[PDB]
Amino acid sequence: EVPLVYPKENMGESCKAPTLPQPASCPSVPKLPDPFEWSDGSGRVKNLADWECRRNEIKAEIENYELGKKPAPPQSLKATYSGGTLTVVVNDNGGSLTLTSKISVPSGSGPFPVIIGMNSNTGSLSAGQFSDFIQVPFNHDQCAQYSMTGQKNTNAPFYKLYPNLRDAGDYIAWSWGISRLIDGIEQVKDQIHADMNHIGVTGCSYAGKMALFGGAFDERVALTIPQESGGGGINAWRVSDTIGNVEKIDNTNYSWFMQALKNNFNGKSDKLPYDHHELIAMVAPRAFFTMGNPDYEWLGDKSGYTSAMAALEVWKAMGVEDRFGFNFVGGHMHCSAAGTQVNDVNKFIDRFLRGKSVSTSNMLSSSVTNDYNSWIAAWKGYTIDTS
């Protein structure tokens, strides 16, 4: 079989860093870059061990051009569970940072699957969809302060611990904090009966982008569920440039992302060696399900829909396309899932987090349409050898 999840945050840390051309020497790839093409233009992924390194090239490209580098695991990490609260103490190069979450543990001997919500248990999905889960809220402000002015708070605890990261995007702090939570859950696992092979992550809107980066950048996340992530999330920068008045390089904020993206690629997103379809593909071969809301134009769902279809090619290539699913539909308020969305994702929570043999074969339901073949025609229908 193809792994559904991995024991380590990054199985490909041993891979060789890709070439990273200066922005002005970057080729103009006007449609969506080829996710299987090595960063140096020298061919295409062949097997699973290759995909891990291509995943790490995508990671390195996203870190280099728009987020900043996720720190490696810290030198020291101590987690404790007392009074319903998990507290995680991080030590690295003479600094400290502490995370604290009020978690809720199901009754019984276990083990229990895990759901990490952004700023809440279960995020913007209902507690009922995870009534049988360990529920761990990620209080993101304990790493970087959420805000919607395009300005950064360099005194937040992450930036105090890595002061030379004050140019990095806030999404790299948040991804790193989610990986520190999972570190602490691992440490206390036998005490709360956590099943480390069934951890999910979810959030909506800004919290949707947070969940996308969080699970893309951590291979111990067995199901990544961004909800209405919009521009800067599942949406491709390129396609969002072709539609109008959406979140895109021109108007997003440059504290969550690096100012370098605007300065080097605004009006020239064809020059990016990557796009966000490959951010989604960093989750492959693990399970992925996302929700759209075309009723809000600011989310740019034609770009999200397009980029999701592009990402699916990576699951197809590995013969696991039933681990990828979405649902685009209107008729619901932002961050409150439509009825069909609650049902669709519940099939994914059952199979990939609860372990039931539900089927998930073709859940690509969307009231949004777009010429997505136009964006992926060059590279498409590739396949990878799975041993």
Author numbering: 22 to 408
What do the paper's sentences say?
Glucuronoyl esterases (GEs) within the carbohydrate esterase family 15 (CE15) esterase family, in a range of aerobic and anaerobic fungi and bacteria, have been identified as playing an important role in breaking down LCCs by cleaving the ester bond between 4-O-methyl-d-glucuronyl in xylan and alcohol groups in lignin. Rumen GEs adopt a canonical α/β hydrolase fold: FsCE15, PrCE15, and RfCE15 adopted the canonical α/β-hydrolase fold that is seen in all of the GE structures solved to date.
Crystals of PrCE15 belonged to space group P61 with a single protein molecule in the asymmetric unit. The structure of PrCE15 was refined to Rwork/Rfree of 22.9%/26.9% using data with a maximum resolution of 2.54 Å. A similar examination of these resides in PrCE15 putatively identifies the catalytic residues as Ser226, His355, and Glu249. The catalytic residues of FsCE15 and PrCE15 are positioned in the canonical conformation characteristic of CE15-B subfamily with the general acid located on a loop at the end of β7. FsCE15 and PrCE15 have a conserved disulfide bond between residues Cys345 - Cys483 and Cys225 - Cys356, respectively, which anchors the general base within optimal hydrogen bonding distance (2.7 Å) to the catalytic serine. Interestingly, it was more common for this residue to be tyrosine in AGF GEs (26 out of 35 sequences) with arginine found at this position in the nine remaining rumen enzymes. We determined apparent steady state kinetic parameters for PrCE15 and RfCE15. Both enzymes displayed similar affinities for BnzGlcA; with PrCE15 and RfCE15 having apparent Km values of 5.0 ± 0.4 mM and 6.0 ± 0.4 mM, respectively.
